[PDB]
C-alpha cells in the first residue's frame, strides 16, 4: 500500500502539546522515532514552561498508533497507516475515576519525512489534592488492550480502553478512554473489522536531562483477527 509504505523503516517523530488543566497552563515538546516493523515507539519529552502540573503518566496515551505492528493477515484493518500521509485527527475524552477529565484533539500527519503529533489538551474538574493534581501516581505504566471498531458513519474508527494507573498507596486509578479517529485527507481509508491493539509501555528518566521530562518506550501489536 501507499500509507503502509511510509512505515517500512524507522520514522522520526515530533510531538507538541499545549495544555490547560484546571486553568493551569503548560507546554510539552517531544521527539523520537517509530518503527512499525517492530511495533516500537521511543520518545523523550520536556515541559518547556517549567514543572509539569500533572503526572507524566497521565499524558502517555495523549503523546501515534500508526506505529502499531499489524500482522500481514491484518494489514487491511490498519486505519492509521491508510490515512497517511495526510493524516488523521485523534480526539479523546479521558475520565479519571472520581476526578476530572481530559479532552484532547490531535492532528497526526507527516510534515516532510517526520510524523508529527500536535495536541491541544483541556482538563477540568480535578480535585486539587486528588491523585492527579496531588501527584500521587507512581512513575510507571502497565499493559493494556485497545479496542477498535469501525465508525462507518464518520469514515473512521472508534476506540475505547481503560488505563490502570498505579497509585503510591497501593491502589489503582482507572482512566476511561473514549477515542475517535477521522481522516484528514479525502483519499480512501481502511475501515477495520473489530480488533484490538496490545500495548505495553515503560517510562524512564534521562539522568542527564536537567528539565522536567519523560522517556517513553511503547510496544504495540495488533491482534484479534484469525488466520
Amino acid at each position, epitope marked *: 500500500s501507499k500509507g503502509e509504505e511510509l512505515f517500512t523503516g524507522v520514522v522520526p517523530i515530533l510531538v507538541e502539546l499545549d495544555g490547560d488543566v484546571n486553568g493551569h497552563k503548560f507546554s510539552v*515538546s517531544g*521527539e523520537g522515532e517509530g518503527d512499525a516493523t517492530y511495533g516500537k515507539l521511543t520518545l*523523550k519529552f*520536556i515541559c518547556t514552561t517549567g514543572k509539569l502540573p500533572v503526572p507524566w503518566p497521565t499524558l502517555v496515551t495523549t503523546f501515534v498508533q500508526c506505529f502499531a505492528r499489524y500482522p500481514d493477515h491484518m494489514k487491511q484493518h490498519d486505519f492509521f497507516k491508510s490515512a497517511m500521509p495526510e493524516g488523521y485527527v485523534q480526539e479523546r475524552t479521558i475520565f479519571f475515576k472520581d476526578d476530572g477529565n481530559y479532552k484532547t484533539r490531535a492532528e497526526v500527519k507527516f510534515e516532510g519525512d517526520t510524523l508529527v503529533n500536535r495536541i491541544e489538551l483541556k482538563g477540568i474538574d480535578f480535585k486539587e489534592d486528588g491523585n492527579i493534581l496531588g501527584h500521587k501516581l507512581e512513575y510507571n505504566y502497565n499493559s493494556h488492550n485497545v479496542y477498535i471498531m469501525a465508525d462507518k458513519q464518520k469514515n473512521g474508527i472508534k476506540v475505547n480502553f481503560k488505563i490502570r494507573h498505579n497509585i503510591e498507596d497501593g491502589s489503582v486509578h482507572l482512566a476511561d478512554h473514549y477515542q475517535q479517529n477521522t481522516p484528514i485527507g479525502d483519499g480512501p481509508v481502511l475501515l477495520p473489522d473489530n480488533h484490538y491493539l496490545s500495548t505495553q509501555s515503560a517510562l524512564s528518566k534521562d539522568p*542527564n536531562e*536537567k528539565r522536567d*521530562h519523560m522517556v517513553l518506550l511503547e510496544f504495540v501489536t495488533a491482534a484479534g483477527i484469525t488466520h
Partner: nanobody, 124 residues
Framework: SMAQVQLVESGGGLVQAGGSLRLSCAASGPTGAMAWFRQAPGKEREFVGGISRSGTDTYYVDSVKGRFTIDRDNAKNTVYLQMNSLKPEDTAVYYC?????????????????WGQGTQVTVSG
C-alpha cells in the same frame, strides 16, 4: 531540513572575578536548538544554558541563572553567551553545541554538533 554543520567558537579569555566576558558561536548553516556546555578541569562536561530554534524557550542551570544570557541570530546562524559577574568557579573550557531538532533538551548525548572548546579563566 537541518543538515550537518560545523561550529566555530570565538570570544572568552581571561578576566578578573566579578568581570564580564562574551562567548560567541557561528554555525556553518542553519541549525536547531543551540547550547553552551563547560568542562572544568578534572570534571565532566556540563550543560550551562541554551536556546530553542525559535528563541522562545531558553533554559539555564541554577548556578548561572541571572548572570548568564543567551540569544541567537537565525539570519547569521549564530548564538552567544554573555557572562556577567563571573566567579572563579566559572573557569572552564566552554563548548558550543547544536542539534538538528528545534527542542532544547539539555543532555550532552542529545547534541550532534560540537565546537572545539574555548577557554574561559576567571581569576580570584
Amino acid at each position: 531540513s537541518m543538515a550537518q554543520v560545523q561550529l566555530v567558537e570565538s570570544g572568552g579569555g581571561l578576566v578578573q572575578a566579578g568581570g564580564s566576558l562574551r562567548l560567541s558561536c557561528a554555525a556553518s548553516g542553519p541549525t536547531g536548538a543551540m547550547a553552551w556546555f563547560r568542562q572544568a578541569p578534572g570534571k565532566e562536561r556540563e550543560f550551562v544554558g541554551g536556546i530553542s530554534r525559535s528563541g522562545t524557550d531558553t533554559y539555564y542551570v541554577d548556578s548561572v541563572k541571572g548572570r548568564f544570557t543567551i540569544d541567537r541570530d537565525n539570519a547569521k546562524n549564530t548564538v552567544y553567551l554573555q557572562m556577567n559577574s563571573l566567579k572563579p568557579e566559572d573557569t572552564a573550557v566552554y563548548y558550543c553545541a547544536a542539534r538538528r531538532s528545534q527542542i532544547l533538551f539539555t543532555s550532552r548525548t542529545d547534541y550532534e554538533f560540537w565546537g572545539q572548546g574555548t577557554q574561559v579563566t576567571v581569576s580570584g
